[PDB]
Each structure stands twice: as C-alpha cells, then as structure tokens.
Amino acid sequence: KNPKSDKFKVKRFHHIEFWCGDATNVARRFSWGLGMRFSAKSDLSTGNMVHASYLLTSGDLRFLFTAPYSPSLSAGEIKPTTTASIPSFDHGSCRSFFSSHGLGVRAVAIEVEDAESAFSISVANGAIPSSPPIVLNEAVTIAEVKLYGDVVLRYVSYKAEFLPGFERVEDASSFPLDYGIRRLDHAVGNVPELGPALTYVAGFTGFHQFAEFESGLNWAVLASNDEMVLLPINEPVHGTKRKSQIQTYLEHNEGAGLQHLALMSEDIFRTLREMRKRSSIGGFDFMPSPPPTYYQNLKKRVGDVLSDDQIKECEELGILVDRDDQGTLLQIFTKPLGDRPTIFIEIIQRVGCMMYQSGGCGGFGKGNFSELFKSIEEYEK
Amino acid sequence: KNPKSDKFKVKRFHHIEFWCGDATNVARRFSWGLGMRFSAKSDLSTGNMVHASYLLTSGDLRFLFTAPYSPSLSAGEIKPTTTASIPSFDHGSCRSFFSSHGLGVRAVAIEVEDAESAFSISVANGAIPSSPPIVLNEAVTIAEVKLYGDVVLRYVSYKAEFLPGFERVEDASSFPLDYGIRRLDHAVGNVPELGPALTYVAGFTGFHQFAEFESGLNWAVLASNDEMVLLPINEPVHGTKRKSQIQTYLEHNEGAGLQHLALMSEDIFRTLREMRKRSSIGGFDFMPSPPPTYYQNLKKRVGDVLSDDQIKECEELGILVDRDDQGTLLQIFTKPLGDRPTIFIEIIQRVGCMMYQSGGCGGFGKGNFSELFKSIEEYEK
Numbered sequence A, B: 001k002n003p004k005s006d007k008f009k010v011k012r013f014h015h016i017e018f019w020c021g022d023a024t025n026v027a028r029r030f031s032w033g034l035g036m037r038f039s040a041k042s043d044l045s046t047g048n049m050v051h052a053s054y055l056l057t058s059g060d061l062r063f064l065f066t067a068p069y070s071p072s073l074s075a076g077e078i079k080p081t082t083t084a085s086i087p088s089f090d091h092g093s094c095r096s097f098f099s100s101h102g103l104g105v106r107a108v109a110i111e112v113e114d115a116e117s118a119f120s121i122s123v124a125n126g127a128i129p130s131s132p133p134i135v136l137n138e139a140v141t142i143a144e145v146k147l148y149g150d151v152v153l154r155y156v157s158y159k160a161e162f163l164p165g166f167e168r169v170e171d172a173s174s175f176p177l178d179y180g181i182r183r184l185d186h187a188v189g190n191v192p193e194l195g196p197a198l199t200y201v202a203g204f205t206g207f208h209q210f211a212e213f214e215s216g217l218n219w220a221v222l223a224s225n226d227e228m229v230l231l232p233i234n235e236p237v238h239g240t241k242r243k244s245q246i247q248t249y250l251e252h253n254e255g256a257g258l259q260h261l262a263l264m265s266e267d268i269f270r271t272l273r274e275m276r277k278r279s280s281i282g283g284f285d286f287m288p289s290p291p292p293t294y295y296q297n298l299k300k301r302v303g304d305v306l307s308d309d310q311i312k313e314c315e316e317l318g319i320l321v322d323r324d325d326q327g328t329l330l331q332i333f334t335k336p337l338g339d340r341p342t343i344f345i346e347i348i349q350r351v352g353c354m355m356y357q358s359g360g361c362g363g364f365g366k367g368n369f370s371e372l373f374k375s376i377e378e379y380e381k
C-alpha cells in the first residue's frame, strides 16, 4: 500500500555532506576508494574564508566533504557579508559535531520543488528547524530541519553548477575515476527508539512506511511518493546474547546518527573487483565474506535469477543476495569508513521491478539476517 | 665549525606524529600518496579505549597518525589504569590542537640513549616540560618537552616493536608499497621570532648552528653532534612586496608550528614518478615546476654532477637542484598536505660528502631562492 502522502513535492536524493576535520584527506581517500571524480570546490582558492568543501561525484551520486578553517580568517564577517558558500555552516556546530561523533554525515540532502515551501510545511508539521531557507544568487534555495541526532534533512530546490560559489575543478586535477557507482539508493539512521523517530519524521514529511517482504534490532523504512527517497531507521534490541550492534553504534557515536549509505552500482561485480583491488592501498575494506554454505544455499533461493557463473562470481567477491516477492537484491558492506565502528557503506544492485525500475526493488536484505545465521551454523558442521 | 655540544646523547630521528580528527582516513591517504606500508596499530582492536594510532613506515621513516575516541569510552580510567598506548596523549589537548591548527605534526620524536636523562637535563637547561618520563612495559621510555607552538620534541629510548601495546598489522592488511623513501632528513618550524626560538631550543639541547653555504624569511639550522638530527627554523620578514609565506603560515596555522618534513629518497626520480602518477588519484600534488630557463641554467651550475639525461629528467619531474661547497642537493616540494596552506612535504636526495654520507650534505636549498627568481625573469624575456 502506497498512500502517496508526501506533504510537499520530493524529487531525488541530491547529495550527502560529511563533516570532517580535514576535508582534503577524507575526500582524496574516498575518491580513490570508491572511484569518484573531484568535480567542484569551495575553499580559500574560491574566496571562501569560512569552510573548505570538496565535491565528489560518480554518476548521480554526490559526496560533499566539508571542514572549518580557523575562525580568525573570517572574524570580520557577519552573515550578510559571509564568504561561506553554505550559509547554514557554523564553525562551532561543525567542530562540536566532529568532536562528538567523529567523521560522519551531517546532511542528507534531497531535491524538492520548492525548498522554502518544504521547510514551512515541515516545521508547521512538527519539524525542528535547523537553518532557515536562504536563496543563493537568486538561483538555488537551501533549508535544513533536524532529522535525528545531529543529522539534518536538507532541502534543495533550483529555479532552473552544484551550488553558487562552487567552482568546477581543473580537468588536470579531476581524474575520471569510475567503478560503476551511479546513485544513492538509501540512507539509514540508528536511534535509541524507533517509534518516536518514525512518528517525528513521517509526521513532518508525510513519508509513508515502505512494505517489507533475534538479530538485535528492529527497523522500518520511510519513503517518498514514488519511493525513490528511502530512509530506513534502526533501533537496538536489548538483552540478546550478542550485544546489539545498534547499541554499540550509539555508544561509540555518542548517540543517534547516520549508520550506512547504500550506493547503487550498474555492475556490482565490476564495482567490487575495483574496490577490493584498492582495499589495502588506501581504499575501503569489506566485511568478512559469508561461508561457502551460504553460496551453496544460493542455488535453491535465486537459481532462477543468477547463473552458476554469476553465483560463483558472488562467492569470489563476498556479495550477499536477497529476494522480495518483486525483485532480487545484491549487496555487500564495507568495514567502518573511519576510526569509530559507526558509519559504513553498502554497495547494492537491484534486479527486477521493471515498469524504469521502481524504488526499493527486492527490499533491503532482511532475509539475509536469518540466512547468514543458518549458513554459519551449517558451515560449521 | 662543529663544537659537538649536545647535552645528552642523541641518535636519529625516530618518528613523526600527526594529530588528526580521523586517523584512518589520513593514514590511508598518506600510505597511497607516499608509498608507505601500514606496519603497526594501537586502537580499539588492541584494547586502546583512548586513541586510535596507526603507524606507516618506509625504510627508516616512521609516520604515526593519532586521533581521539569519545572520552566516554575511557571515562572510568585513570592514568594508572589507562588503556592509552601513548601516556602523554590527552583528549582535550588533541581536540584543542586540531581545532586550532588543523591537521599537522604534534611530535618530532628523536631516539636518545636515555629519555629520562634527556628530559631532566633539558628542563634543567630551560626546556618547558610537556609530559614527564614514563617507562612503558619496563622496555621503552618516552618524555616530551615543548619545541615551538604546540609542537613537542619527544625523547624515546630503548633498553634493548614500535611501542609496547602496538601490534604488528596483518600481512593481508599490510600491502608492501615503496616509492623509494628511506628516512627523515630534517623537520622545519615556523615561528614569529627566530632569535628567541633558537636561543630556547639550542639552550636546552646543546644543538649547534649548522653552517650554511628579499624572499621574505630568515632561518637557521640547529643540529646534533653528528648533524643527523637537523631542525631548521624560519621567521617571517615583514614589509616585502610579496607577503611573507611564513606570515601566511602563522596566520592560517594560528601561530607557530611545523612547516615541512623533508624525506630522503634513495632514488628521487623513481619517487617523483611514483608520487606524480598518484597526484590526481588520492596522492599529493606538487608545487608548480620552474621554467625551462631554470633547467637551461642547470648545466652551468651542476653540469659536472648531473648528466644531460639526468638534467632533462629533472625538468620532466620539476626537481630543484642546489649545491654546497661539499655536495649537491635535489629537492621538490608538495602542495600543502591538508586543507590549510600550512604543512607540506619535501622530497630530497643528497649527492656527495662520502666519508656513509655526512648529514646535511649540500645544504637545504638556500641558493634556489635566488635562482628561482632569476629563472622566472629570464624565462619571461
């Protein structure tokens, strides 16, 4: 059931902004590890005395990395005279965020028809305001409301190139890396209590619950009208034999925040070959692979969607597989992106639900919790 | 003249420690950009609830990257029960350092015969104490005194594998990168006033001034007895047409700190080929190359040390060349390592002064200030 109850018109995920201590080193690491091109900048070289922001792109996926300069560089500025390209930025907030949570996502940004309207309707419907709507160079409007923890949902709308005051980066400085990643599929938050978080977010967005099909968590997924903006939320379950990884997140993160970003690839096998080649030379590591029993058991569950070669090519790369009543999902998870066991990345590819592919085809891998358990015990014997 | 007036026995540069916001991303970036292997760790996986520290090595060069975890992870600890592997570490100091200066060097560490003695004699001779001598697992002694700004000179001595509580990293996780870098040649500080900084440091070390042979700086070099520990210090010169880059450093860094690290390569040409291949795929960028006139003028000044092929191979790579009355130096400079125009890296190779090669053979490139000026104007015509 899709009641299509969005309270304002939502388009697609627009970008994800990381708040960093040094944006240069995180951005260069991510570019190599994920195969994303440097495409725009806003920093001292573009007149920004407030923050350094570097934009990486791969297909429609946009990763923004932002860090504060010394406040002394802009101590004479006021908001009307600011040189910041992102008017919501605040030195204090950024330093406080990074010292509290370490490296992670500050903004989940979605493009909307009218960011001023989205903001007004959101806060009229219970959203906690974070940064009021601001029109940038009469062309782009940005607004922000609290999402969970210190993460904001950022609305961006365009009258008619990332943001004004960002410059396209020099072709010499911009190497065309590409490992097949194409867009953000979903963005997942961890919270102490799922109910109140769901009530808050669905309350001010009108996003509806996306239908699904002992592991220490409960979750639900909020979706926009066409189900292309997908926001799962996890809560821990206490008392289990193995401590809830959601609780471990909340402790190391100092509370609620973004748990993982799921990046759709147009060829997950090429992506995983390319990322795994770079794991030990500056890229990302991957979760330990499932046992061979998991891949032995894949014939019975998806033998009609994947060939024997494609299945064995999953086992080489550690890829996980799950299936809906509509489609099939291939997924794999990185180790944490930084020092703390908090944010990680998911690479996914969806098979089926062709009408274009409808959003969320195949689900989010719920069945793989039960299946991973079965396979580790089967394999032991 | 070398009066050999060290007040305690100094051996070699031991390591350089960067204070970071996220040590993982900086370390992985540096590993790829510089060709340094991951060789030791101290973090949550080794029982350290206080800080994440990752060690990169290339030859004798040791780069340590350290960031704080949430203080809540260790809130029940006291110094006698600490899980930190580096007892001088302090959450507050580290966060304050990084928020003030951004990414940069916290410790210049030299190995000495007796770190307790080095500390006592240092502070008896005017050194400002920073962290008292501590014996780690009855095997290694660490002590720290203020050097300049928020940079400490760290003494390490071994009774008889980096530090106790660090683990050798998994061979699978430890890819054997190597672009030819072999050891730290010198480490350079920028200060507002050269005189008082020199008086302080030479006062408590007994290091002597190393003999040398309109650009906005004055400098001098302090050296240990065998001149293998080399600590140049710069001060700005005000009033010049072009603003002193030393003054620009002090402003963006919020005061005194480490300006550059000079890394000796056993084959600067291989190093520069390897680093330049990676500049736009996650590595380091290099200063703009000098004009062809600089390389035309190299025949007259070093045509008896470098072949025509070797000279043209310098021009391909942007390498700079200078000469002492004893030896010849090849050098090149990276762009700043992080967001701020502060710390950068120098790659160097020294030719001559064979006895082993005596320290500082060829100098530090003083002649290249005058020569670069001459060459840009010559080239214009």
Ligand SMILES: C[Si](C)(C)CCOc1c(S(C)(=O)=O)ccc(C(=O)C2=C(O)CCCC2=O)c1Cl
Residues within 6 Å of the ligand: A186, A188, A219, A232, A233, A234, A245, A260, A262, A287, A320, A333, A346, A364, A365, A366, A367, A368, A369, A372
């Ligand atoms: C952190 Si973990 C030590 C890697 C153990 C969890 O990992 C998985 C696994 S699975 C079989 O690996 O356990 C499967 C799916 C997902 C996943 O994406 C996801 C959603 O997007 C929304 C619903 C909640 C959820 O879980 C995740 Cl996080």
Ligand SMILES: C[Si](C)(C)CCOc1c(S(C)(=O)=O)ccc(C(=O)C2=C(O)CCCC2=O)c1Cl
Residues within 6 Å of the ligand: B186, B188, B219, B232, B233, B234, B245, B260, B262, B287, B320, B333, B346, B364, B365, B366, B367, B368, B369, B372
């Ligand atoms: C920051 Si800059 C925009 C790259 C301009 C400076 O660069 C250079 C140049 S040179 C010809 O490039 O001007 C040559 C040598 C060195 C150098 O290493 C050095 C020492 O170790 C100790 C003495 C002081 C000193 O300067 C440097 Cl920093």
Ligand SMILES: [Co+2]
Residues within 6 Å of the ligand: A186, A188, A260, A262, A346, A364
């Ligand atoms: Co997911």
Ligand SMILES: [Co+2]
Residues within 6 Å of the ligand: B186, B188, B260, B262, B346, B364
């Ligand atoms: Co130098």
